[PDB]
Ligand binder design. Structure first.
Ligand SMILES: [Mg+2]
Ligand SMILES: [Mg+2]
Ligand SMILES: [Mg+2]
Ligand SMILES: [Mg+2]
Ligand SMILES: [Mg+2]
Ligand SMILES: [Mg+2]
Ligand SMILES: [Mg+2]
Ligand SMILES: [Mg+2]
Ligand SMILES: [Mg+2]
Ligand SMILES: [Mg+2]
Ligand SMILES: [Mg+2]
Ligand SMILES: [Mg+2]
Ligand SMILES: [Mg+2]
Ligand SMILES: [Mg+2]
Ligand SMILES: [Mg+2]
Ligand SMILES: [Mg+2]
Ligand SMILES: [Mg+2]
Ligand SMILES: [Mg+2]
Lengths: 66, 271, 70, 117, 103, 88
RNA sequence: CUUGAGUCUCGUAGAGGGGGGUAGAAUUCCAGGUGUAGCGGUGAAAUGCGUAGAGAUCUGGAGGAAUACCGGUGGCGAAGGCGGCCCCCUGGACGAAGACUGACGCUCAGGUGCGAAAGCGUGGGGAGCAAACAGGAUUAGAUACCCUGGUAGUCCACGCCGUAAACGAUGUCGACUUGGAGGUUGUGCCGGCGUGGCUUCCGGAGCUAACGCGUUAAGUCGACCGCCUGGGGAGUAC
């Protein structure tokens, strides 16, 4: 668990922070359920938005088979 | 605007009119007019060579600029006009040097709009550019088939072409017919669609409305005697033969294109 | 589930690694899920019933831990 | 004829059949075998054993190319996913990579209607 | 006057045009009486997946405070500039004057 | 909705002070401003039914406030509807 | 007069709505390369597809539709409903301090508006799916269930239709009346203690024919509306 973003006082998740976002995607590129990472729901939604934005900018892959 | 007529008389019950209040109500621009008298569909042998042509209203010809050759000089749309010679409306445009021209009215165009042709003209409806300067995917009309010859494709009301690909000296176009066609990328096209799209929604309502347009009645081949038409004859309503033209060519599916000279430019036919 | 066979790794071990990668990514479950169309009403009914059964089972377990069988 | 020494084994493992195609790394087929073409029909066609025999036969069909190393791409939910890879390994190929390439729509098209059996 | 975050990716074969692009876009913004709050030239990055068969692109990140109309003009510029292979314009609540995690 | 500036301007104009945000004239003027503004939105977005429900709520509340004002002080009511150009 | 109702200020979450753009996955089709005898399908088959080179695999292209994961007895909406990402326009809700108006309220026959899916009109579009339809099976038959195909339609614009087990089978508004465990979204103070909104499950009194409901009542009350009066005939006939 240990939702990191509340303990870091973030106001957003920042789609440009690929280091943080790689901790929330599986090796195939899928977004990890918050019931596994322990993320709070609000920050899970922020995280999903950020990952989708990063995927659009090709900073993250959609899958591992591009 | 598409407006139905009220059934105050049987010839009006089914009439559907296209009313465009934006169209100039006065006379057309006289220096761009010339007479064009009727043919009755007869050629210089005086023989009918295209049937069902005759009568209809007197019409003056409007000299329309299909070439759009006046590069780098802006023009402003003065007004839109009814043109009897074509389905599309036309626009009287005024160039900054004082010259006036008629152009095909694109969809959306209206009085006060600015237009321009040339290599550096902005990508805006009504602007005309060589197609090598127009983005792939764009919607265009009045497309040239040879550079400098003047637009010949997509001129009727509502029509347009899509620039689907560019390969070297050629672009591939999707014509309204569905045909995929190549022409040289130096050929000019005008951004946007031809206006007056509701033209096809009109309903003539009565026979006389076809007569006003210079269309004479069509007589069915099966209504004649054998001497007149392959379909002719029979005691009662008979047919019993494969449908043909008055001249005997099969007229239900038989193909007639034979132009080996232009086959190379057809990427795929319409189907 | 892309798997690279590491050096001096027996084949059966790497096959197991690939199998676990596939079972983790849920590829077979996704394929089976997508064989046929299930109406949204059926999907919602299935999800609701699964949640209800999960909750009822959990409560039965909690209240059986207070129950002596013999 | 041509010697390749580095190939890809594509295992199309459907519920009813298993197709094994061995290609070079550019995707050109060198030889193929199927569970359905290896003396198995109907119920026997869709078994791990029929897939194993198909893998053996496809390995035989590419002996002339001198292939030594195999990437393995598995596609589909069929019973021939694993036994095909085991048979390719027992055929003497050095399996250097195993990848699942099963197509997953990210929504995609509406599947056929549910069967009522 | 709204705050925007703009990222645009340039064809890697046009990287040396990026400085001129940056100055021109900044000029349009500032002529509209807008401000440049952040501006980062990330240079060439490897794409996470191919785009138009390319495996690289030149990223530029701008945080501006401009009226909507100049942003629409800029998006139209991005649309018709074949050097710009992708772009994203986002609204932000406030001006972001900081350093992105890419620097 | 109305911006802070337009709201404050209407409050100053129709209110008896810049703090008098609650008087019936201020409420009616704010509603009228938003209704007139939204005419342009709904001319373009004719199928925006969900927003139009909020617009019709604005119309209904304004009608109720006007009726209250007319029953309470008819002269104030007349002044208000003349300033804002309302039929009734 | 300010306690109901409402306005303003500052923020908060949200698949609320309308418009436009765009991304990646996949299906299908088209062109070509490699390759060769099968593929596909079922309970088993057959129809079908394939040596005129299919299926498999690789490359390039076209087009339509839907947005995996996130995703949740999670959220938003009056209901119907709403799910990639980005912008433009826009509705509602909620919280904290105040300030303001001063009963401006509740309900609502008739009226008006919205209203899933299917359907209808005109014009587009059409990948996938699929009423109808065709063939193959199954069977005593099989106008089905299963298989191979497949057209309306499903999609878009605009108009119509006005109905659903449109359901919580529970009208709206207000007040009051033991508890427990969660979810979600605010906010105050020092992970603890409060305090609001929405929400899931259990349960006490009470209520209920019983099943059950149980502070989100089907409990205790008030305001107003809708509706019922044995089964069938019939939500039919006129
Ligand atoms: Mg004729
Ligand atoms: Mg005729
Ligand atoms: Mg006769
Ligand atoms: Mg004859
Ligand atoms: Mg007869
Ligand atoms: Mg006969
Ligand atoms: Mg099937
Ligand atoms: Mg009523
Ligand atoms: Mg429908
Ligand atoms: Mg229709
Ligand atoms: Mg179809
Ligand atoms: Mg069927
Ligand atoms: Mg009913
Ligand atoms: Mg419902
Ligand atoms: Mg329900
Ligand atoms: Mg009911
Ligand atoms: Mg209970
Ligand atoms: Mg009836």
């Amino acid at each position: 668990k240990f939702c990191r973003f509340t303990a870091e006082g973030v106001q957003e998740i920042d789609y440009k922070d690929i280091a943080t976002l790689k901790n929330y995607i599986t090796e195939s590129g899928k977004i990890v359920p918050s019931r596994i990472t322990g993320t709070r729901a609000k920050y899970q939604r922020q995280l999903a938005r950020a990952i989708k934005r990063a995927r659009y900018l090709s900073l993250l892959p959609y899958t591992d088979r591009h | 605007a598409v407006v139905k007529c009220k059934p105050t008389s049987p010839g009006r019950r089914h009439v559907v009119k296209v009313v465009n209040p934006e169209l100039h109500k006065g006379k057309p621009f006289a220096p761009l007019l010339e007479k064009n008298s009727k043919s009755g569909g007869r050629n210089n042998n005086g023989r009918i060579t295209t049937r069902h042509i005759g009568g209809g209203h007197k019409q003056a010809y409007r000299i329309v600029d299909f070439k759009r050759n006046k590069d780098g000089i802006p023009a402003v749309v003065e007004r839109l006009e009814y043109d009897p010679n074509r389905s599309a409306n036309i626009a009287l445009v005024l160039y900054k040097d004082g010259e006036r021209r008629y152009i095909l009215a694109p969809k959306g165009l209206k009085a006060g709009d600015q237009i321009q042709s040339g290599v550096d003209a902005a990508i805006k409806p009504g602007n005309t550019l060589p197609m090598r300067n127009i983005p792939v995917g764009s919607t265009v009309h009045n497309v040239e088939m040879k550079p400098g010859k003047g637009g010949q494709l997509a001129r009727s009301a509502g029509t347009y072409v899509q620039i689907v690909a560019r390969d070297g000296a050629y672009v591939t176009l999707r014509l309204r017919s569905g045909e995929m066609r190549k022409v040289e990328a130096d050929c000019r096209a005008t951004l946007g669609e031809v206006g007056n799209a509701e033209h096809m929604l009109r309903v003539l309502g009565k026979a006389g409305a076809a007569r006003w347009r210079g269309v004479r009645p069509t007589v069915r081949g099966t209504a004649m005697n054998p001497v007149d038409h392959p379909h002719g004859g029979g005691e009662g309503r008979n047919f019993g033969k494969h449908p043909v033209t008055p001249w005997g060519v099969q007229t239900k599916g038989k193909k007639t294109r034979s132009n080996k000279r232009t086959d190379k430019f057809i990427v795929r036919r319409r189907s | 589930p892309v798997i690279k066979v590491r050096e001096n790794e027996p084949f059966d071990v790497a096959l197991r690694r690939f199998k676990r990668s596939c079972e983790k990514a849920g590829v077979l479950a996704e394929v089976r899920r997508r064989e046929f169309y299930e109406k949204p009403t059926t999907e919602r009914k299935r999800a609701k019933a699964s949640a209800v059964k999960r909750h009822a089972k959990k409560l039965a377990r909690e209240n059986a831990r207070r129950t002596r069988l013999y | 004829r041509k010697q390749v020494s580095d190939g890809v084994a594509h295992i199309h493992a459907s519920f009813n059949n298993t197709i094994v195609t061995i290609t070079d790394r550019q995707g050109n087929a060198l030889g193929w075998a199927t569970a359905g073409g290896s003396g198995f029909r109907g119920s026997r066609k869709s078994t791990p054993f029929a897939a194993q025999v198909a893998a053996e036969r496809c390995a035989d069909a590419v002996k002339e190319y001198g292939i030594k190393n195999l990437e393995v791409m598995v596609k589909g939910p069929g019973p021939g996913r694993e036994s095909t890879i085991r048979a390719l390994n027992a055929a003497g190929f050095r399996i250097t990579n195993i990848t699942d390439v099963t197509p997953i729509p990210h929504x995609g098209c509406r599947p056929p209607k549910k069967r009522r059996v | 006057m709204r705050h925007y975050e703009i990222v645009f990716m340039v064809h890697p074969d046009q990287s040396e045009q990026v400085p001129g692009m940056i100055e021109r876009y900044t000029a349009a913004i500032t002529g509209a009486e807008g401000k440049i709050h952040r501006l980062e030239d990330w240079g060439r990055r490897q794409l996470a997946y191919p785009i138009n068969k390319l495996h690289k692109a030149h990223y530029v990140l701008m945080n501006v405070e401009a009226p909507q109309e100049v942003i629409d003009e800029l998006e139209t510029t991005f649309r018709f500039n074949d050097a710009v292979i992708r772009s994203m314009v986002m609204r932000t609540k406030h001006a972001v004057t900081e350093a992105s995690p890419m620097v | 909705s109305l911006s802070t500036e337009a709201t404050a301007k209407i409050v100053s104009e129709f209110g008896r002070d810049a703090n008098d945000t609650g008087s019936t004239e201020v409420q009616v003027a704010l509603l009228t401003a938003q209704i007139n503004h939204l005419q342009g939105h709904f001319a373009e977005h004719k199928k925006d039914h969900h927003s139009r429900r909020g617009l019709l709520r604005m119309v209904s509340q304004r009608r109720k406030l006007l009726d209250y004002l007319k029953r309470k002080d008819v002269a104030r009511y007349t002044q208000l509807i003349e300033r804002l150009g309302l039929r009734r």
